[PDB]
Design a protein around this ligand. Structure first.
Ligand SMILES: *[C@@H]1O[C@H](CO)[C@@H](O[C@@H]2O[C@H](CO)[C@@H](O)[C@H](O)[C@H]2NC(C)=O)[C@H](O)[C@H]1NC(C)=O
Ligand code: 8PR
Ligand code: NAG
Lengths: 537, 118, 223, 110
């Protein structure tokens, strides 16, 4: 089995999958809404209890077994083969809606290449009767039905929501946005076909370019008037909110969505590695800096919308009343065009949203191609240049339901209802498989032989008690009441939760089927055919 | 309601300058365009240009840049077209029309009375 | 021709429900909100809550969590309300108004119906004694940062209030030139030059920087 | 500039008969769903009054004897049985940017 090139190669990819473009809007918006500066207090207690040790055990299975996604269960407990088959179809399900997010930013790159941006004026073919964002000298008013010019460029031209009605009519995919999918998917295919050799070099440019982009964008907001109003609503501690049980669960779901452990993507990094490296130091620095990136990237957004609170003359909660991916392309996009030298700052920000998205889908394609190779030798991936080409075309044709004119409605149901509870259910079932079924007394023996020391008292109790109980509280309150996903004054029908749960449980129905697949083919006494499939060979 | 009032007519001679205006009232002229159309008795229509007030963008086509200079101002709430170096063949009828928004397809809902530039 | 009709008063037993309505006319019902303003007996104004007619959702103050709701009707352009658990402290007068969007102000005001049974704005003393025609001044201080959302109203005993100043710097349509004000951040002042007997009424300091909106105490010119 | 012609040059419709008028062009201005093609009607002494919003919806001040539909590179305005008072000229107008071109016009007679 091959390995990485240098030592710092695979330490740069674990942080690169940990950070994405989701860390700039999904984290700091729940901070400002739920008590301001008091939201950082559950961010550091729930990380050491549920975030960090569950992030650590996924590397420990990949370090010793040095196998893929599906073959690690062959030497632990073979009934849990449905875990690795579940994450394969979510990787086809994630790549349908996730690549459209940078495709909106890739269209913004060619649109903002000119000197005159279309966001500082209403000189276009949108609904110009509501495009009245010019701030005159006390002769300006907007009726309930008015819109923003950043919204009209997002809804009329890119998504074309006027051409559709909702889930009943999706129609004909935009041809201009379809060309952006071909520009994205070319760079994905030309970096994974060789393996870890080209994957070890492409991250050297794409994982540090957004980090230097956070530095040049912070000095823009630092010497910016009205930036002190944004840090006021961000840092003010409100301890009256923490008595509610709702803010505790939403803070616990944020750390799990940011790092994203147990999905099978990260264990491919530890498979192509020597056993002599300290996994304790490699896992501790990644979870520490990821809180540091989400703290720094909250400063570059809230200091700019504080200037929007000055010009539009409202509170920062009123200008940020939306909740979702529209925080970057509606509110933050219009703030760049009103700045001097707007041609330079618009490119470096919208290319930052490009590079943070492609690091997550660089590694996500490696986790699905490594699984089919080791379980079926000399059957799949005999020629590595051809068999990964069959993988990339399936998520290309699968994304045709997301490139429609009603494409904004399908990415809302698939992010929250479909892939939302699916990533918790696949991660809780693997947490009890290694802890209870495989045994906590057996698991620490493989860690001390590759390191040289036994783990402490904190790591032994939290692997059996805290980490199964950490994901149980989040999945219970999520299946309490179906929320109403409001997207541009269009209310979803009552059967939207029915179709949303059915596409979400299609991966979750695979795991009770795959435990039933082996108890049929394995003959003998009903007690003996089970216990043969818990204890490995 | 919305009205568009032009100025009086003017006789065309060799080397004269004719200034034509069109006052906008009853709506917000900063969020719309101002179209101009050529009209000759016995011929059809022809597009000249547009004025988008607020920022100063002006588009020219159909070789009318050499004689027609389209300039407007937000404070007095009207537009102007500065004509220069006229001949006898440049005699035509000018109109100003209010353009609708992009949802209606930039249509000319209202029109002026038109001046006789000959 | 903006006019808001008001229903007649009624005597309701405490603990029961009440129904209050006001029909909107003269404008598009979906273009503006439908806000309600509490007029307590012998004291200042209070905010009640706002309704969104396009979606049916509503936002209100924390004191109306288990007391009242807000519904509207698009077929008749008339909003409905239902207060529950009446007490002796709820002796007040309900109002109906017109409100714009971004910013949220109060342009028109209704006649009202009597019911028989945050950023706070601190002001100066209310009882000021000056001669007729002299330049007066009204001082209003803010507890937090308010950029420009300062307004001033004028309410007569027995008459309905009205909007006077626009964003604390310029006049409104239908307002004489004697009313002018300024301010920036925290030093919000208001002055009237050459006062008359017609302007002798109760003034109010306003704040619209953040939801929920909080009204002021009130001042009086005598003279 | 986009080439925009008009055919025929003159039409003779009797009392009680229907007709149609088209605008020949190389575009296909069908961008973002809205058909970027307008219609006008200029009378002698009157300005070219608007008829239909983007060849799909009747505007204000227009009588109910006018309609229009179509798709692609060929439209067709639907005219009711006309009277003697409809002596005017109809024009084409493609409003797709950035350069606009107008039609030639046809003579309406009885
Ligand atoms: C932008 O403004 C226009 C005004 O022309 C709004 O048009 C309204 O559309 C609805 C149907 O969607 C009609 O029922 C209304 O009658 C129209 N307006 C009026 C005043 O009649 C348009 O809805 C506005 N855009 C948005 C997103 O609200
Ligand atoms: F619900 C959620 C599922 C997975 C996550 C991840 C958590 C870590 N940071 C990146 C997030 C997106 O993961 C991706 C992106 C592209 C992919 C992919 C995975 O596999 C195929 O192509 C987040 C949320
Ligand atoms: C409708 C409206 O508010 N109009 C006002 C106008 O009365 C005032 O004169 C001007 C400032 O000069 O600001 C604007």
């Amino acid at each position: 089995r091959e390995t990485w090139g240098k030592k710092v190669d695979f330490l740069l990819s674990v942080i690169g999958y940990a950070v994405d473009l989701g860390n700039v809007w999904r984290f700091p918006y729940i901070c400002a809404q739920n008590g301001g500066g008091a939201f950082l207090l559950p961010y550091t207690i729930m990380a050491i209890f549920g975030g960090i040790p569950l992030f650590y055990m996924e590397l420990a299975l990949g370090q010793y077994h040095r196998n893929g996604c599906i073959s690690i269960w062959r030497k632990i407990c073979p009934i849990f083969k449905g875990i690795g088959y579940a994450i394969c179809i979510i990787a086809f399900y994630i790549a349908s809606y996730y690549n459209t997010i940078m495709a909106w930013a890739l269209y913004y790159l060619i649109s903002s290449f000119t000197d005159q941006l279309p966001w500082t004026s209403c000189k276009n073919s949108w609904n110009t009767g509501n495009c009245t964002n010019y701030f005159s000298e006390d002769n300006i008013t907007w009726t309930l039905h008015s819109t923003s010019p950043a919204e009209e460029f997002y809804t009329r031209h890119v998504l074309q929501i006027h051409r559709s009605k909702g889930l009943q009519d999706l129609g004909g995919i935009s041809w201009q946005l379809a060309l952006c999918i071909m520009l994205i998917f070319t760079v994905i295919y030309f970096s994974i076909w060789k393996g870890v050799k080209t994957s070890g070099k492409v991250v050297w440019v794409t994982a540090t370019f957004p980090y230097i982009a956070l530095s040049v964008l912070l000095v823009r907001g630092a010497t910016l008037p009205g930036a002190w109003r944004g840090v006021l609503f961000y840092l003010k501690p409100n301890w009256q909110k923490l008595l509610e049980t709702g803010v505790w669960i939403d803070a616990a779901a944020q750390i799990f969505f940011s790092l994203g452990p147990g999905f099978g993507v990260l264990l491919a990094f530890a498979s192509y590695n020597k056993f002599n490296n300290n996994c304790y130091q490699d896992a501790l620095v990644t979870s520490v800096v990821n809180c540091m990136t989400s703290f720094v990237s909250g400063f570059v957004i809230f200091t700019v919308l504080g200037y929007m609170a000055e010009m539009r003359n409202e509170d920062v909660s009123e200008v940020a009343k939306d909740a979702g991916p529209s925080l970057l392309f509606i509110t933050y996009a219009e703030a760049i065009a009103n700045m001097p030298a707007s041609t330079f700052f618009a490119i470096i920000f919208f290319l930052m949203l490009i590079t943070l998205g492609l690091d997550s889908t660089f590694a996500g394609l490696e986790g699905v191609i490594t699984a089919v190779l080791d379980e079926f030798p000399h059957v799949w991936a005999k020629r590595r240049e051809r068999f990964v080409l069959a993988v990339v075309i399936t998520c290309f044709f699968g994304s045709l339901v997301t490139l429609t004119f009603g494409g904004a409605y399908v990415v809302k149901l698939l992010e929250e209802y479909a892939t939302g509870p699916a990533v918790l259910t696949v991660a809780l079932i693997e947490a009890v498989a290694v802890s209870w079924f495989y045994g906590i007394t057996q698991f620490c023996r493989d860690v001390k032989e590759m390191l040289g020391f036994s783990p402490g008292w904190f790591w032994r109790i939290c692997w059996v008690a805290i980490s199964p109980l950490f994901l149980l509280f989040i999945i219970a309150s999520f299946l309490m009441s179906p929320p109403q996903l409001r997207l541009f004054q269009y209310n979803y029908p009552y059967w939207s939760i029915i179709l949303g749960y059915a596409i979400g449980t299609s991966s979750f129905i695979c795991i009770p089927t795959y435990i039933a697949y082996r108890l049929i083919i394995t003959p003998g006494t009903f007690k003996e055919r089970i216990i043969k499939s818990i204890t490995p060979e | 309601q919305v009205q568009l009032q032009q100025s009086g007519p003017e006789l065309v001679k060799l080397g004269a300058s004719v200034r034509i205006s069109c006052k906008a009232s009853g709506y917000r002229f900063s969020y719309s365009w101002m179209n101009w159309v050529k009209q000759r008795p016995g011929k059809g229509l022809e597009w000249i240009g547009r004025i988008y007030p607020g920022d100063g963008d002006t588009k020219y086509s159909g070789k009318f840049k050499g004689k027609a200079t389209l300039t407007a101002d937000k404070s007095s709430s009207t537009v102007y077209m500065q004509l220069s170096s006229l001949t006898s063949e440049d005699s035509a009828v000018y109109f100003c029309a209010r353009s609708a928004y992009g949802s209606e397809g930039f249509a000319m809902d209202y029109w002026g009375q038109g001046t006789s530039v000959t | 021709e903006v006019q808001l009709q008001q229903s007649g008063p009624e005597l309701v037993k405490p603990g029961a429900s009440v129904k209050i309505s006001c029909k909107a006319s003269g404008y598009t019902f979906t273009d503006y909100y439908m806000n309600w303003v509490k007029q307590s007996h012998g004291k200042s104004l209070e905010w009640i809550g706002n309704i969104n007619p396009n979606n049916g959702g509503t936002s209100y103050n924390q004191k109306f969590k288990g007391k009242a709701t807000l519904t509207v009707d698009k077929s008749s352009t008339t909003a409905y309300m239902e207060l529950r658990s009446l007490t002796s402290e709820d002796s007040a007068v309900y109002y109906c108004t017109r409100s714009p969007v971004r910013p949220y102000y109060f342009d028109y005001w209704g006649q009202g119906t009597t019911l028989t049974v945050d950023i706070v704005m601190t002001q100066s003393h209310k009882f000021m004694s000056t001669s007729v025609g002299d330049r007066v001044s009204i001082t209003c201080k803010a507890s937090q940062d308010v950029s420009t959302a300062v307004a001033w109203y004028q309410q007569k005993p027995g008459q309905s209030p009205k909007l006077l100043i626009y964003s604390a710097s310029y006049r409104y349509t239908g307002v004489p030139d004697r009313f002018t004000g300024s301010g920036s951040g925290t030093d919000f002042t208001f002055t009237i030059s050459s006062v008359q007997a017609e302007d002798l009424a109760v003034y109010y300091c306003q704040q619209h920087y953040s939801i929920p909106r909080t009204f002021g105490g009130g001042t009086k010119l005598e003279i | 500039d986009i080439v925009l012609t008009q055919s025929p040059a003159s039409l003779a419709v009797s009392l009680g008969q229907r007709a149609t008028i088209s605008c020949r062009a190389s575009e296909s201005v069908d961008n973002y769903g809205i058909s970027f093609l307008n219609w006008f009607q200029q009378k002698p002494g009157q300005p070219p009054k608007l008829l239909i919003y983007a060849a799909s919806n009747q505007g204000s001040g227009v009588p109910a004897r006018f309609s229009g539909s179509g798709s692609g590179t060929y439209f067709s305005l639907n005219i009711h049985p006309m009277e003697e008072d409809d002596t005017a000229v109809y024009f084409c107008q493609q409003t797709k940017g950035v350069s606009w071109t107008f039609g030639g016009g046809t003579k309406v007679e009885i």
